[PDB]
Amino acid sequence: LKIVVTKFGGSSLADSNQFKKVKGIIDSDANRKYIIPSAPGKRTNKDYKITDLLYLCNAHVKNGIPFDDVFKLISQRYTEIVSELNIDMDIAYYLEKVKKNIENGASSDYAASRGEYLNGVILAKYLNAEFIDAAEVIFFDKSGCFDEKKSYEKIKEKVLSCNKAVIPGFYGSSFNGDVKTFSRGGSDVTGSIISAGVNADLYENWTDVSGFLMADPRIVENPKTISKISYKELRELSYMGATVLHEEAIFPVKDSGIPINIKNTNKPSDPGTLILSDTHKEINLGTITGIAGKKNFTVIAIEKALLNSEVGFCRKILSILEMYGVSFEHMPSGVDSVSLVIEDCKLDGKCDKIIEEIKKQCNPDSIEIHPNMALVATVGTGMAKTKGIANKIFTALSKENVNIRMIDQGSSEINVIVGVETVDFEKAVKSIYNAFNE
Amino acid sequence: IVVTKFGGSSLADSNQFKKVKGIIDSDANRKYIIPSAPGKRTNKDYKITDLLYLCNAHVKNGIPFDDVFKLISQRYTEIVSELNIDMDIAYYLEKVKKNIENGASSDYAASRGEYLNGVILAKYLNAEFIDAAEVIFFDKCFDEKKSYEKIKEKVLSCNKAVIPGFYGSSFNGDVKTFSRGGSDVTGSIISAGVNADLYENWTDVSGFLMADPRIVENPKTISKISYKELRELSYMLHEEAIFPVKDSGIPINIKNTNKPSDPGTLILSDTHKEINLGTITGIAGKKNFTVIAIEKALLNSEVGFCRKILSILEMYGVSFEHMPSGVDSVSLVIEDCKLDGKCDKIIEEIKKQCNPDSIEIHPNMALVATVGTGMAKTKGIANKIFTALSKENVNIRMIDQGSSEINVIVGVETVDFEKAVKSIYNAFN
Numbered sequence: 001l002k003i004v005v006t007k008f009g010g011s012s013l014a015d016s017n018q019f020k021k022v023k024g025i026i027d028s029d030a031n032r033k034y035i036i037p038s039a040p041g042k043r044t045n046k047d048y049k050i051t052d053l054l055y056l057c058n059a060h061v062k063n064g065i066p067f068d069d070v071f072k073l074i075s076q077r078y079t080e081i082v083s084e085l086n087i088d089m090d091i092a093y094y095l096e097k098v099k100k101n102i103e104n105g106a107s108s109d110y111a112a113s114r115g116e117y118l119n120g121v122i123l124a125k126y127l128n129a130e131f132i133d134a135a136e137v138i139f140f141d142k143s144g145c146f147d148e149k150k151s152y153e154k155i156k157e158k159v160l161s162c163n164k165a166v167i168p169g170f171y172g173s174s175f176n177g178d179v180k181t182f183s184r185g186g187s188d189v190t191g192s193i194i195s196a197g198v199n200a201d202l203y204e205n206w207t208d209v210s211g212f213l214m215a216d217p218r219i220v221e222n223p224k225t226i227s228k229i230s231y232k233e234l235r236e237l238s239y240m241g242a243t244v245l246h247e248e249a250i251f252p253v254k255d256s257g258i259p260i261n262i263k264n265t266n267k268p269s270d271p272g273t274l275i276l277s278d279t280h281k282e283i284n285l286g287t288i289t290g291i292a293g294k295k296n297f298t299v300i301a302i303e304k305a306l307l308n309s310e311v312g313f314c315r316k317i318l319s320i321l322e323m324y325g326v327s328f329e330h331m332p333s334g335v336d337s338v339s340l341v342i343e344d345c346k347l348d349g350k351c352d353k354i355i356e357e358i359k360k361q362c363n364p365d366s367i368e369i370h371p372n373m374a375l376v377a378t379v380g381t382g383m384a385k386t387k388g389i390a391n392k393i394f395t396a397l398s399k400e401n402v403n404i405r406m407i408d409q410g411s412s413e414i415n416v417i418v419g420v421e422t423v424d425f426e427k428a429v430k431s432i433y434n435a436f437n438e
Numbered sequence: 439i440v441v442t443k444f445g446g447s448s449l450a451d452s453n454q455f456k457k458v459k460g461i462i463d464s465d466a467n468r469k470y471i472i473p474s475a476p477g478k479r480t481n482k483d484y485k486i487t488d489l490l491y492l493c494n495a496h497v498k499n500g501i502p503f504d505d506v507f508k509l510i511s512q513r514y515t516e517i518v519s520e521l522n523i524d525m526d527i528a529y530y531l532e533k534v535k536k537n538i539e540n541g542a543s544s545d546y547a548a549s550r551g552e553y554l555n556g557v558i559l560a561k562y563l564n565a566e567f568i569d570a571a572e573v574i575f576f577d578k579c580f581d582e583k584k585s586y587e588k589i590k591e592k593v594l595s596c597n598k599a600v601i602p603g604f605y606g607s608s609f610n611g612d613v614k615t616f617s618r619g620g621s622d623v624t625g626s627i628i629s630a631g632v633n634a635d636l637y638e639n640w641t642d643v644s645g646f647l648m649a650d651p652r653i654v655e656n657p658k659t660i661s662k663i664s665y666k667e668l669r670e671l672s673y674m675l676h677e678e679a680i681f682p683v684k685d686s687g688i689p690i691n692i693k694n695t696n697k698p699s700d701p702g703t704l705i706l707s708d709t710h711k712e713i714n715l716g717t718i719t720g721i722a723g724k725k726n727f728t729v730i731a732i733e734k735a736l737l738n739s740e741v742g743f744c745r746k747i748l749s750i751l752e753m754y755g756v757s758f759e760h761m762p763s764g765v766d767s768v769s770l771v772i773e774d775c776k777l778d779g780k781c782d783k784i785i786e787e788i789k790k791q792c793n794p795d796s797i798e799i800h801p802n803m804a805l806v807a808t809v810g811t812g813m814a815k816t817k818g819i820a821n822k823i824f825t826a827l828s829k830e831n832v833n834i835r836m837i838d839q840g841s842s843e844i845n846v847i848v849g850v851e852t853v854d855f856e857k858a859v860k861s862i863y864n865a866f867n
């Protein structure tokens with residue numbers, strides 16, 4: 001039958017109760033064959049986080065001290081869990097071995113990866129599934145990059161040959177056989193990898209929210225869930241940037257046609273958003289997929305006599321922005337003028353020196369600054385390229401009496417970006433949603 | 439005190455000189471005059487300034503240039519002859535042949551076009567000839583302080599005066615030619631010095647029009663235009679000619695030598711020009727560009743991805759009009775002719791230094807810039823424009839606005855250019 005592969009995040013394994021939710025989800029569908037765990041999430045704001053505490057042990061070892069006070073809390077964390085779940089195992093055998101390894105000079109990467117490992121070994125028992133260490137099945141190369149062709153070969157050999165298997169998350173083996181952890185991707189990528197390697201049908205990604213929403217729920221009331229979403233589509237929304245699964249995490253799935261379903265461990269019935277492939281997603285005829293804005297931006301408007309004739313005028317301008325840790329969002333231009341739209345935190349403090357260097361090299365006539373802009377990105381495949389689709393957005397914004405301060409449509413076929421006064425941000429986003437939902 | 443510039447077309451020949459006289463003594467206040475060298479009479483005709491550079495070229499190869507100079511001297515002696523002016527123009531011409539053949543600079547040569555026309559003007563119009571070299575000065579760049587001193591002394595002390603206008607004296611007293619606004623800058627320079635009330639720029643067109651008459655039948659005339667609009671409407675005309683008058687009150691007034699009754703248009707300061715909320719000032723376009731679509735995984739997290747791309751564009755003779763960018767893509771809008779021949783070399787270079795998942799070339803795009811201060815903070819201006827374009831089935835390939843409050847730029851398929859331009863005008867008229 002179908003081969004679904006599941007990952008559960010920190011919030012899904014914060015304590016014993018969540019684990020019961022995970023067991024529930026797993027034996028509620030026999031096709032949930034493969035399970036990838038994160039390390040226990042914080043259960044309250046001021047709670048300590050395991051992985052961090054692990055690193056800290058390694059710090060004691062670098063510093064030539066015991067870390068017995070620290071490792072108490074770890075074992076304490078993990079013994080309460082396997083106790084409350086009343087599981088037939090001796091977790092100390094695992095903890096005790098980890099402690100030793102660390103104080104006998106284990107790498108940081110080894111140290112911090114044990115949060116996922118321990119959850120792995122617990123879950124294999126608790127869910128009656130074969131435990132398969134990551135270090136056996138995921139491999140890196142000489143530079144430090146993910147060796148694809150090998151890992152999958154191994155996955156097919158070791159993982160798809162099991163009926164039900166747990167596979168810990170956040171790490172694999174380095175070229176030299178020693179434990180290497182991912183730098184970007186967390187337990188999500190390892191989930192994607194496994195799916196790729198097993199040729200899974202679905203990769204369920206279990207979190208604490210029932211998919212993604214069409215808009216910010218603080219702003220719009222009771223906003224629809226995004227039934228379906230392409231990768232390119234999602235990427236556009238990710239940047240602007242709604243709290244959504246990052247590109248880093250899903251590159252292995254992307255090559256093959258493996259759909260991801262974002263799902264909620266605390267409301268499993270709730271259907272997900274279903275992140276499809278570009279050529280695997282259909283195209284709803286003239287419609288919005290999502291609306292995602294970010295506040296706090298400032299434009300640097302640069303009027304210059306025949307700016308259009310001379311070459312390298314702009315090249316000089318962002319050679320200067322490269323000279324600091326400051327990226328630009330957009331470079332809207334006119335006939336003999338050009339702007340730079342730049343986020344405020346990215347500009348914080350540095351602003352002043354930058355205006356001077358451009359004045360030296362480029363030699364404009366006017367150089368003003370106008371802050372208090374926000375950006376609203378409205379995204380969808382079906383607006384690519386529908387008639388009057390930007391006009392529909394401007395009609396909306398006209399009805400709410402809100403002055404437009406930037407338009408970009410042209411950067412991307414599935415995306416119109418509108419820039420407006422920061423006061424009007426929430427008003428705009430509202431207006432555009434209503435425009436497309438009855 | 440009304441200063442006046444006359445362009446080469448307005449001095450192309452004796453008949454045009456007559457027209458100029460008719461204008462000048464139909465207003466006592468037209469007290470000061472700047473001519474250009476004579477424009478071309480027909481399209482095949484030679485152009486005196488260029489002939490002057492050509493003599494300079496013969497001297498650089500140490501060959502005579504009599505054939506060329508015969509053509510210039512003939513050109514000028516005919517004007518005075520036809521005008522029946524009692525002067526000895528050969529006095530002036532012969533001196534010019536000598537200086538040129540005595541290794542004089544190209545700037546000196548080119549200047550003679552308007553110098554010579556100037557001494558002629560003095561007579562026809564009966565005004566005191568004031569060489570620009572003795573009044574407009576440069577440093578070691580324009581010497582604002584020193585020149586204005588000499589203008590009040592030498593010019594302002596005259597009832598009528600003629601100052602030729604494509605040049606002045608350099609630091610070391612040599613002749614120097616404006617690299618920038620021709621005779622239009624002289625007219626402004628004088629206008630400031632001689633603290634004028636109006637500056638008439640006399641062209642062969644009765645001001646500017648809201649849109650191209652080729653495209654919209656009988657377009658309204660642009661009575662008043664701010665400096666900032668004018669620039670932003672450059673697709674239709676100067677900026678480097680206009681600096682000095684900016685800080686002045688002095689309004690420029692573009693006017694028609696062949697139709698002096700026409701009020702023309704009036705280039706105003708931004709603070710002087712009034713703002714009509716919900717109005718356009720003009721619509722202007724240009725129609726052979728190509729967009730280069732470039733796509734990449736995490737384009738924006740790269741180290742100066744765009745910098746690198748237009749660095750590559752910097753190392754060729756390619757100026758671009760717009761750079762749309764976002765998330766995981768970037769576009770370059772480059773004028774077809776500016777791209778001519780260099781295209782495939784450019785594709786590789788960026789394909790080399792960058793990681794492009796994809797590169798496509800979409801040509802056939804024409805830009806339309808609709809402009810006016812009255813679309814400043816006003817709601818619905820975009821919306822008014824684009825409803826117009828929807829109505830008429832014009833597919834929009836790019837919208838760019840954000841560089842200026844008083845300008846939206848649409849990109850349409852070149853076939854829809856006229857249709858679009860017409861539509862926008864109709865929307866606001």
Ligand SMILES: N[C@@H](CCCC[NH3+])C(=O)O
Pocket residue numbers: 307308309310311312313314315333334335336337338756757758759760
């Ligand atoms: N042509 C300029 C940019 C002009 C932007 C405004 N039209 C360049 O290549 O740097």
Ligand SMILES: N[C@@H](CCCC[NH3+])C(=O)O
Pocket residue numbers: 327328329330737738740741742743744745763764765766767768
């Ligand atoms: N700031 C980026 C460009 C981002 C434009 C949006 N994709 C760079 O340095 O090239």
Ligand SMILES: N[C@@H](CC(=O)O)C(=O)O
Pocket residue numbers: 445446473474475487548552603604619620621622
């Ligand atoms: N044609 C002159 C300008 C002018 O006199 O209008 C030049 O050489 O720039």
